């Protein structure tokens, strides 16, 4: 019960991380659903733990299309973030908003969502 509890501790670190991401997803969901679909930021999407205070701008998976339609998951009720229009079916559950359009974006844009409105 030495290394097993060690990887359990790693799973608990990932639990605190994914609950920080889920908490910021909830408050960020509130400030995004406060916006009338025009002052929305261009948001990086992912289906992986994306940890906005530890964002890595390395891979070409970074994308900057305007988010919308952040509705539930009605077996577990979630904020869900279609990255395009209604009819693109690109639902995700991990988002980080950034500055503007594509190509070597700026870095983080943390907690400036009230300055978008």
């Amino acid at each position: 019960h030495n290394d097993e509890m060690y990887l359990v501790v790693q799973a608990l670190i990932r639990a605190c991380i994914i609950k920080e991401i889920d908490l910021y997803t909830e408050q960020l969901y509130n400030i995004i659903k406060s916006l009338p679909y025009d002052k929305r930021p261009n948001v990086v999407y992912s289906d992986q733990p994306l940890d906005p205070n530890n964002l890595d701008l390395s891979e070409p998976e970074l994308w900057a299309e305007q988010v919308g339609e952040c509705m539930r998951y009605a077996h577990n009720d979630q904020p869900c973030f279609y990255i395009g229009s209604t009819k693109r079916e690109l639902r995700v559950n991990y988002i980080v908003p950034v500055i503007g359009v594509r190509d070597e974006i700026e870095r983080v844009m943390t907690l400036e969502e009230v300055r978008n409105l």
């Binding site: 659903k33 406060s34 916006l35 009338p36 679909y37 025009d38 289906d47 070409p60 994308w63 900057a64 299309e65 919308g68 509705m71 539930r72 998951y73 009605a74 077996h75 009720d77 869900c80 395009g84 229009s85 209604t86 009819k87 693109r88 079916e89 639902r91 359009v101 594509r102």
Partner: protein
């Protein structure tokens, strides 16, 4: 009076209603306790087995018919085909003899060998059970007792196959035309040069290994064409020339590989034989299967990429071949290669015109638009531009094969650039753990790959000729056609992938129920009355279908009124009702003796306050009292049960009491809140019944007459029609012009936004900004297939809304409709609306305007569902959109956007800089170049007799000026250039006199070239009428350099922001308003012509009399 009194209810039209049927009571429990589910699934899968095994049985029937058929007139068609024909009406005797072969093989098809026990119940119930060994399938056949509706549909397909139509699906066209003309072609190859090829391998070794049949040299006679038409003749004949394994480890090749193996001069300029086709009868379901197809076809070392290397080696062989005899198919891509090699497109046309000017054009040119249209159809008529002809079209320092070769290595080098980023995709262990529908970059790789390969496929299919022509090259066309067919196979791979990736996440599977009756309600309570076992019950706003089980329907007719409650009126008089009771049929349903499926939709709800749909208003006026016979029922009502697609795991909701945002920025509210659940696509997670009720409208007509003649008679006495220009625009994507009969603008407006009307509330919704953001999505998604399908279907809903607006214009104004035409031969490729979507627009005009129904009118009078308007004939083909269809007046349009709406001047001066000789001739053609200091403008009094292609003017002598300023778009850069500052910039520059009149000879005194080039530049800016910005939408104005007789110039900024625009506002209103004035000219032709002369009035307008009417009728 009005013009709508005679065009109502003229002819018949059938429709198919669709409504919602849900189970009521214990009907689902009785279907579960009578075992109606396994026999429809098993019977359906066995039906797919019947379609497969009748493809196989009909394949054996083709094997039986085409086996023992001999020919008699074979040698005459061969010989007279290859005697280098002598056409004194000879080829109509040759081709008529070929028609005698078509009636010979069609006489063999129709005359004998069965032909009567083939599309009935005996081929499927008597001949099929004695066929098909491994007799479990025979037990799968006998469960189709009398259900031959999908069987008679498949029989309709299999009688559309074998007919006297001679298409690619017809076997007689394929074998006679393909196998006989390729057979005679192989005898023309085989008799000319085969003595160089071989005399020892063919008859000694190949005959011994392959067949030990008759000789291969004897296979070029009458005996073999009677044998090759079987499947074994195709297997042997393609086993000799193509090769065959010969049931060993030999894997021998054919004759063309021996032509490659002959090694005469290490070039092998020898003809190759043509392969002959087989019979006409020879995954899109998972990510890994279509991905495995991509791991089969487009990998690194396939035969497909090897055939592409045979195309590159084939253009190397083209570099060491000749340049004569290789034909080019005439189309739009000869302009594309004109842009590739030469400067512009029609330059090659002009060089063709040069040879045409060698033939028809003499001194004192008599060139008219009839000469340009006969010249254009002569350009279509040639169709056989060879490479030596393009070499004669080439000027000095213009190498066709060298610039052609460098730019095609540029194209396949760009394809190699796509392949360079495609190597690291599927190297070693490519099992992509994500979804194919989820990842973005791989779809971009395969998309750019299939777009490069498919665009190269359009280019190489533009490198065909005409076929069956004169002396043509003999080794290029073999690998050209074969690698072309391999490239058509990867075109099918593009079809499979593009049809797979855009799959929606909800599936639609409907199937008709029968309830074990092959007589299910084919009429409407006829004299049978027990074979249909179903009738329409009604209760208020809820309808109830009564399906009777046959074990109780024989003694179910006990219909008491009962005088209490629950009058379920049954339908009869095949149309009236008979009352009944309530608790009797409640006992029947609750004991399991009757089925009652509720007919209902959204519009029969009590929780509703708005205007219903159109099918519901068809259905309410169906059973109404004063139905004189307008809307009646018809047979073939079809109840489709539909399964579930969205499972219970992936449902996403809008919850209760949560203020969510709102999409439309034109919403006066910003948030909204409900007290319950709003799901995402609830209508697909259920199991649902959907009923089709086919009705017929005006089955007994009133007035059958010619529509267009009556339109031309009633508008002959009329003085004020209206015309509705619907034109594809650069910025305003759709626009509406509605003009009177005289020419004054009545109502012009744009369709960037749609005004939604509900409960008196008028809320607009813009599609210019929305589809502008959809073009932002197409501008950035790293994927476009789903994006382009969203643009296509978004424009389909958009043009449906436009269909509503045009129907409101016909129901409100009752206009004649000139809109924009698809068959004028025009192609601009600048607007955001493509051609196929507008084909769907006019297709929905044909399918909509057959019987047009207003929704908010009186059903007693005209306009409703009972007496709707019939203003457009039926649908025939895409080529039926020819100049007139009912009130839809199709009008072709040449030179309407780039023409002055005030005066009518069009771009006739070709101000492309050619040389200094035509520049001195250009300035010397001006009869009066004078300057005045008071106006500070540059006057140009000139004659249109001294210029090329300016004979279409009526006056020929005009006074021009230069007013305003221009935007020189590229020195983009936005180089805004004024008028007096440029000429005084050049005249204060170079220091010549300009303070004097009549300086047309002082301008020709210069010998430098940049003076003439800059003057041609200022003529290009002065005649550039499109004075737009192409940046922001600040001022998209249209100012003209030509004033009218009133003395004022047309500045569109003054005539835009007005309450009553007497002039058009932009180029789109210019174009559509000029099409409107073309129908004003056509009604002028209605005023010129006679009464019966209206049968043949020319409506297709020219341009010379359009310049005459455009100039001489401005006021």
């Amino acid at each position: 009076m009005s013009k709508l009194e005679k065009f109502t209810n003229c002819y018949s039209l059938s429709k198919t209603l669709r409504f919602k049927a849900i189970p009521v009571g214990k009907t689902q429990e009785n279907i579960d306790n009578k075992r109606l589910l396994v026999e429809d699934e098993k019977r359906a899968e066995d039906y797919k087995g019947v379609k497969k095994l009748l493809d196989r049985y009909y394949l054996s029937f083709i094997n039986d018919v085409l086996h023992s058929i001999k020919l008699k007139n074979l040698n005459n068609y061969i010989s007279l085909f290859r005697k280098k024909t002598r056409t004194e009406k000879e080829n109509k005797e040759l081709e008529n003899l070929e028609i005698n072969l078509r009636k010979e093989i069609a006489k063999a098809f129709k005359g004998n060998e069965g032909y009567k026990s083939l599309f009935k119940k005996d081929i499927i119930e008597t001949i099929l059970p004695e066929f098909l060994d491994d007799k479990d399938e025979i037990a799968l056949v006998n469960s189709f007792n009398g259900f031959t509706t999908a069987f008679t549909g498949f029989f309709d397909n299999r009688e559309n196959m074998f007919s006297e139509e001679a298409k690619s699906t017809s076997i007689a066209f394929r074998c006679i035309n393909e196998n006989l003309t390729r057979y005679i072609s192989n005898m023309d190859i085989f008799e000319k040069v085969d003595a160089i090829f071989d005399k020892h391998e063919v008859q000694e070794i190949k005959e011994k290994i392959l067949n030990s049949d008759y000789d291969v040299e004897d296979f070029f006679e009458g005996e073999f064409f009677n044998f090759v038409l079987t499947q074994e003749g195709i297997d042997v004949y393609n086993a000799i020339i193509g090769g065959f394994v010969t049931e060993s480890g030999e894997k021998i090749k054919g004759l063309n590989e021996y032509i490659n193996l002959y090694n005469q001069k290490t070039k092998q300029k020898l003809p190759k034989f043509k392969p002959l086709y087989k019979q006409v009868l020879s995954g899109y379901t998972s990510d890994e299967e279509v991905l495995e197809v991509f791991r089969n076809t487009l990998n690194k070392n396939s035969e497909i990429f090897s055939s592409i290397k045979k195309l590159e080696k084939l253009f190397k062989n083209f570099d060491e071949y000749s340049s004569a005899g290789i034909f080019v198919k005439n189309g739009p891509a000869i302009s594309t290669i004109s842009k590739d090699i030469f400067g512009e497109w029609n330059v090659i046309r002009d060089k063709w015109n040069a040879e045409y000017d060698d033939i028809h054009l003499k001194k004192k040119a008599v060139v008219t638009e009839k000469y340009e249209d006969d010249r254009r159809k002569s350009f279509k008529k040639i169709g056989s531009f060879s490479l030596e002809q393009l070499q004669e079209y080439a000027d000095a320092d213009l190498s066709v094969v060298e610039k052609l070769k460098e730019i095609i290595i540029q194209k396949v080098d760009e394809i190699y650039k796509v392949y360079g980023s495609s190597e690291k995709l599927f190297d070693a262990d490519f099992v992509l753990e994500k979804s194919l529908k989820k990842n973005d970059a791989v779809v971009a790789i395969m998309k750019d790959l299939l777009d490069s390969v498919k665009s190269f496929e359009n280019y190489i299919k533009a490198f065909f000729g005409e076929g069956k022509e004169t002396n043509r090259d003999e080794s290029f066309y073999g690998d050209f056609v074969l690698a072309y067919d391999i490239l058509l196979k990867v075109d099918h791979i593009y079809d499979a992938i593009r049809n797979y990736v855009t799959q929606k996440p909800y599936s639609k599977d409907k199937f008709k129920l029968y309830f074990q009756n092959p007589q299910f309600m084919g009429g409407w309570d006829k004299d049978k009355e027990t074979d249909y076992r179903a009738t329409i019950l009604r209760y208020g706003s809820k309808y109830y279908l009564a399906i009777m089980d046959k074990k109780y329907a024989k003694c179910l007719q006990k219909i008491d009124k009962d005088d209490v409650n629950g009058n379920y009126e049954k339908i009869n008089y095949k149309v009236s009702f008979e009352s009944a009771s309530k608790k009797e049929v409640d006992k029947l349903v609750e004991e399991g003796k009757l089925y009652m499926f509720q007919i209902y939709n959204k519009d029969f709800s009590d929780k509703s306050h708005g205007t219903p749909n159109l099918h519901t208003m068809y259905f309410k006026l169906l059973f109404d009292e004063n139905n004189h016979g307008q809307i009646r029922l018809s047979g073939g009502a079809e109840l489709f049960m539909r399964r579930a697609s969205l499972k219970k795991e992936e449902l996403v909701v809008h919850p209760a009491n949560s203020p969510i945002a709102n999409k439309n920025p034109d919403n006066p509210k910003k948030t909204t809140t409900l007290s319950y659940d709003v799901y995402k696509d609830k209508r697909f997670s259920e199991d649902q019944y959907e009923l089709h009720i086919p009705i017929a409208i005006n089955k007994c007509p009133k007035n059958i007459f010619k529509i267009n003649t009556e339109v031309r008679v009633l508008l002959k006495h009329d003085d004020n029609p209206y015309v509705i220009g619907i034109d594809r625009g650069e910025r305003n994507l759709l626009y509406i012009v509605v003009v009177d009969g005289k020419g004054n603008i009545v109502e012009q407006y744009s369709l960037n936004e749609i005004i939604n009307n509900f409960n008196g509330i008028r809320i607009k919704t813009d599609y210019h900004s929305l589809l502008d953001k959809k073009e932002k999505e197409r501008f950035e998604a790293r994927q476009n297939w789903t994006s382009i399908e969203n643009i296509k279907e978004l424009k389909a809903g958009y043009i449906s809304q436009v269909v509503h607006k045009i129907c409101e214009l016909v129901e409100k104004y009752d206009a004649v409709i000139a809109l924009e035409d698809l068959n004028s031969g025009f192609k601009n490729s600048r607007v955001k609306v493509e051609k196929q979507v507008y084909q769907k627009f006019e297709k929905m005009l044909i399918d909509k305007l057959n019987y047009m129904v207003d929704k908010k009118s009186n059903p007693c009078a005209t306009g409703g569902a009972l007496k709707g308007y019939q203003i457009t004939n039926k649908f025939e083909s895409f080529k039926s959109m020819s100049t007139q269809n009912g009130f839809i007046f199709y009008i072709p349009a040449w030179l309407t956007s780039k023409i002055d709406p005030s005066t009518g001047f069009v771009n006739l001066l070709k101000t492309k800089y050619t040389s200094i000789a035509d520049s001195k001739k250009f300035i010397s053609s001006f009869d009066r170049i004078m300057y005045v200091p008071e106006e500070d403008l540059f006057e140009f009094a000139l004659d249109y007799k001294n210029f090329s292609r300016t004979d279409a003017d009526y006056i020929k002598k005009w006074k021009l000026y230069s007013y305003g300023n221009r935007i020189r778009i590229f020195r983009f850069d936005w180089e805004e250039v004024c008028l007096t500052s440029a000429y005084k910039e050049l005249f204060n520059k170079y220091g010549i006199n300009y303070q004097q009149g009549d300086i047309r000879a002082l301008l020709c005194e210069q010998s430098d070239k940049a003076f003439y080039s800059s003057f041609m530049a200022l003529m290009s800016l002065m005649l550039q009428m499109r004075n737009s910005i192409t940046g922001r939408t600040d001022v998209d104005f249209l100012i003209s350099p030509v004033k009218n007789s009133d003395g004022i110039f047309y500045d569109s900024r003054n005539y835009e922001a007005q309450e009553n625009a007497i002039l058009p506002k932009n180029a789109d209103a210019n174009g559509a308003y000029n099409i409107a004035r073309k129908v004003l000219w056509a009604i002028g032709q209605f005023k010129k012509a006679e009464d019966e002369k209206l049968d043949k009035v020319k409506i297709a307008i020219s341009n010379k009399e359009w310049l005459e009417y455009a100039q001489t009728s401005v006021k």
